[PDB]
Amino acid sequence: GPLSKKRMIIRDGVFYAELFEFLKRELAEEGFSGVSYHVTTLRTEIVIKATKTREVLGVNGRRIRELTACIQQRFNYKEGKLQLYVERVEVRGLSAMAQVESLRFKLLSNLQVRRAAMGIIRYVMESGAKGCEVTVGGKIKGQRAKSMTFRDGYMIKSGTAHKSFVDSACRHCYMRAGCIGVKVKIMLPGDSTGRNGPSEPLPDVITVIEPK
Amino acid sequence: PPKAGQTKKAKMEAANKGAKKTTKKWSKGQSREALQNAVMFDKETYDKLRSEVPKYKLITPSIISDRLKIAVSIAAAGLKQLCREKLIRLVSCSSKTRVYTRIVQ
Amino acid sequence: GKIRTKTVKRASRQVVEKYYSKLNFDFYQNKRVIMDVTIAESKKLKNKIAGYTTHIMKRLARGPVRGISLK
Amino acid sequence: MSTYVPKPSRDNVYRFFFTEGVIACKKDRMGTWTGTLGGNTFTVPCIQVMQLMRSLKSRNLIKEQYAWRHYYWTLNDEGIAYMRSYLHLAPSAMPNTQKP
Amino acid sequence: QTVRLTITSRNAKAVESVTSQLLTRARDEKVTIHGPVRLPTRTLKITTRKTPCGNGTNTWDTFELKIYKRIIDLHAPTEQVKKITSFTMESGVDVSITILD
Amino acid sequence: GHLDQWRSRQKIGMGKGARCCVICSNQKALIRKYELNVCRQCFRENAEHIGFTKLR
RNA sequence: GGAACUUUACCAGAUCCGGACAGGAUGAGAUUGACAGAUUGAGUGUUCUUUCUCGAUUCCCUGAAUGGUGGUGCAUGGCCGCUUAUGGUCGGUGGAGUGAUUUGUUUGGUUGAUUCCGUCAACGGACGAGAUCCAAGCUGCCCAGUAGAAUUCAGAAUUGCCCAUAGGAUAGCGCAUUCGGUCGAAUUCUUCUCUGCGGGAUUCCUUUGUAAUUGCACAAGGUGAAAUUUUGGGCAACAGCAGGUCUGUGAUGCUCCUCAAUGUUCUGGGCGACACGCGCACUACAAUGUCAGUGAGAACAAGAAAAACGAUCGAACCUACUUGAUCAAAAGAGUGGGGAAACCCCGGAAUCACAUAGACCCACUUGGGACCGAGGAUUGCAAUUAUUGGUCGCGCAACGAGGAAUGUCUCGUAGGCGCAGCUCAUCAAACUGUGCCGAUUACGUCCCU
Ligand SMILES: [K+]
Ligand SMILES: [K+]
Ligand SMILES: [K+]
Ligand SMILES: [K+]
Ligand SMILES: [K+]
Ligand SMILES: [K+]
Ligand SMILES: [K+]
Ligand SMILES: [K+]
Ligand SMILES: [Mg+2]
Ligand SMILES: [Mg+2]
Ligand SMILES: [Mg+2]
Ligand SMILES: [Mg+2]
Ligand SMILES: [Mg+2]
Ligand SMILES: [Mg+2]
Ligand SMILES: [Mg+2]
Ligand SMILES: [Mg+2]
Ligand SMILES: [Mg+2]
Ligand SMILES: [Mg+2]
Ligand SMILES: [Mg+2]
Ligand SMILES: [Mg+2]
Ligand code: NA
Ligand code: NA
Ligand code: NA
Ligand code: NA
């Protein structure tokens, strides 16, 4: 029987959740910045966003075919019905998932916490971001655990508008003494096109037309 | 947990063994006298209903029971009969409640 | 409690400065002017601005108002 | 549910692993794993294929990923060469991921 | 021969940016149309505790998922209908072809 | 012999032992509504990717 | 976190290695698996007797490794709760101090509001508040063969003289009413319903009101569907807590066990065990009632399955109708429909109503059903420690309004009343929502916290 329309979207959501999780673990070393799919009658067209496009494709498209085999076998895709593409992030410093993975890799490379977190913040605001906040917590200064937050710029924290103007991501960094949690929130600037911006004015800002 | 200080197992055991019954009765109560109401009509009681119950300004099954020392179930039955013979008239009526009154002249 | 916050008061002072000639003593015609000379995500704030612009205009007709500069 | 894998079933699993450079198997002790191997199809218990990939991973012949009760194993360059030696396939034979 | 066009999606904006396109393409095809009906919006509700351990005030999390559905009935042949539907939709919108008798 | 005795109750496939969590294979506090079969704790982390949004 | 097995972490016992890999001793006989008898709780090759089968996958021992609902939340991540439901918080440059620090961020009025106006050694900013978002009410366009309505033809029903076993009150004074099975046609339309963007409300209007001696505002009334954060929620800063969780995870450091295991399965039991104390509910103590009838009548919602199995559908899931029925309930069957605005469904919920001329009549009583006995059916691999209904018994079990104390609440609210989802093979005195009937009191204060 056809699944109820309320059961088809649940299946579609659960499938995307698993697909997102698989690529997060597989493409952690690259700046995996989301995945989108477009199911048509002929194929599926799964598209992967990452900062290091060359590292996810491999040589002569080796790794992207390994990922295609992974998804094909997991979800039982007939041959030729699944296609995978990878596209580059327009602004690397405006992606919280790419910046949080960069920060986690810095910490695992024995970088200093204040130096690494500060280095992320400058790069984020060199890219045109309105604000940025980086949080690092865990066993940084000894047996006792402390959480240190570094801020710069604007950042709204209340209401629902902060879910469309702020890009956020968190990661677990497993160090020798224990796991360390890193959070990166980036307040996106507005865009006329909306390609890498919320594309709407701030909910509280009120501009007045200059008389002509 | 609030583990009581210096409380024994013998202290525990003696506490539950003495905790049966005893403390109760937080209300005064103020018992009442029983109501001896007849469930069927006697000759003299039925005579009162046919004569004394009319020419009452307000007639109600609970009132008649308070006068003739009878149950309300048969007090209402007699009132329905007195209406069938037009001795009393029914002013207010429902399934649960009936009000009667004496006829004029 | 119906105080106009500083976002409404500042924006309504900007509108009076820029479009004093077009404004009036009534809410509904002024609110129409506020609709196209302002960009805001919220209709409620545009409604509160139109209410305070009319309050400024009634204040201006009686005398000068601090915070409003008309050349 | 036994980990005493047969030699023919190990060879069939290794043949699928070389033909398709990846094997995806569900993490459950009951249940069975299904593969094609070009023509027809074959089935082996999930615990047995997981047992084979434990050996390969401990020998650094595969890389292992796990997400949502599902395993993902991929042969590496040393693992591919071992499969050619074990399956006795002639040189220049490569998996569909390697093949253009 | 009436053909039924069923559109359903999670996105309110995308669910009718295809119905408007389907309505427009058929108007360019001059095929008589029974207007797009907005079927009732069904909300999927899941209410769970916020905590992972059962400590503190018992606070809950109400999660909602809305489904938007539209239908267009048009008197057009299968070939003509396939022309109307042969264009790129957005992600997360599925369109169903159904023939009514 | 021992092979048949192994996991006999599990192959029956009824009760809370049969049902587990599709993300972490946990048998406690499972959301079976809409056939999600997701933990209540795993749901709150994956609710946005599935499509559920937190309003009112 | 409603535990029959499982879950399950505990207890009494029995299996398996799910000890990868590396180095050695065996080895094409390394090993695997087993019918019969007995060992055993086990027609459990667990082991044993006896052999057959398998085949280089494995066994033996040394290190190692893995797994764990093992410890430690006082080693941690993440999330949550709380401080803390109020209005709070922080730089830069300038001023003041030897300095911690201070000013800004202050007093006056106002506001739920560090909300505004004014003043000013501060000037410029940032976050929280507000704004934003989601649902309700009023309304626009769109819209229907998954929603409906009004007419016109036909077909059928009532039809006028009627005064209840006592029969009051309550609209009618060109064409008389009905008839979702009469499963009848035709035509017209969007009054109800569906809904993606809109509109609409803001102190907008008025006081010879308060205040004003600029202002920011306030109170009554008006307009209005709505009259003050419109109503109800969601989000919610900065600083913390040795708050909770290592029993959510393939989140995790250190440490513990690791082949008669703290791993993992299987059998059985336990989590339920009762002199007792406490939290939170359910049912009551009756007549503004209990029974037995009859009427009119909601809203939110849920409904079936795979790379399995049979011939792309078809069965699981929910139901309606009929039957069982030539005689109890609960059942059991057959047919059809529904992937869910399509079937359930014109969603016949219970409070409620009844001038029902119904029974009871103040009593631990036809109140109240605790407790227990016997029959029967259903769910399940398994019902004993009653799984759950239904039938007849018990009702002589307390309980007649509850001491000191104490919880929550301001209008479609409290209280009452059901219904759905969720846990769910079976099982709500639970929670999460939903609608139904619907008040008393206050429009305050800083006495208590
Ligand atoms: K279900
Ligand atoms: K377990
Ligand atoms: K913590
Ligand atoms: K505060
Ligand atoms: K100084
Ligand atoms: K006040
Ligand atoms: K909160
Ligand atoms: K905090
Ligand atoms: Mg803000
Ligand atoms: Mg707010
Ligand atoms: Mg139970
Ligand atoms: Mg265990
Ligand atoms: Mg664990
Ligand atoms: Mg703690
Ligand atoms: Mg200060
Ligand atoms: Mg504070
Ligand atoms: Mg057991
Ligand atoms: Mg318990
Ligand atoms: Mg019984
Ligand atoms: Mg519970
Ligand atoms: Na200074
Ligand atoms: Na300063
Ligand atoms: Na641990
Ligand atoms: Na006080």
CSV table of C-alpha atoms in Angstrom, one decimal, chain A residues 200-212, chain C residues 7 14-15 18-19 36-41 45 49:
chain,number,residue,atom,x,y,z
A,200,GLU,CA,15.7,39.7,5.3
A,201,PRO,CA,16.3,42.8,7.4
A,202,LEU,CA,16.8,42.5,11.1
A,203,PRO,CA,13.4,42.1,12.9
A,204,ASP,CA,14.0,45.2,14.9
A,205,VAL,CA,15.8,47.5,12.4
A,206,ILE,CA,13.6,50.2,10.7
A,207,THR,CA,15.0,52.0,7.7
A,208,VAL,CA,13.5,55.2,6.3
A,209,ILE,CA,13.5,55.9,2.6
A,210,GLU,CA,15.6,58.9,1.7
A,211,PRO,CA,13.3,61.4,-0.1
A,212,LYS,CA,14.0,61.8,-3.8
C,7,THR,CA,13.4,52.0,18.2
C,14,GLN,CA,13.3,60.3,11.4
C,15,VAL,CA,10.0,60.1,9.5
C,18,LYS,CA,12.1,63.6,6.2
C,19,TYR,CA,8.4,63.7,5.3
C,36,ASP,CA,6.1,52.8,1.7
C,37,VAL,CA,8.8,55.2,3.2
C,38,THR,CA,9.9,52.5,5.7
C,39,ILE,CA,11.4,49.0,5.5
C,40,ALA,CA,10.5,46.9,8.5
C,41,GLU,CA,9.8,43.2,9.1
C,45,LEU,CA,6.2,48.5,14.7
C,49,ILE,CA,5.6,54.5,14.5
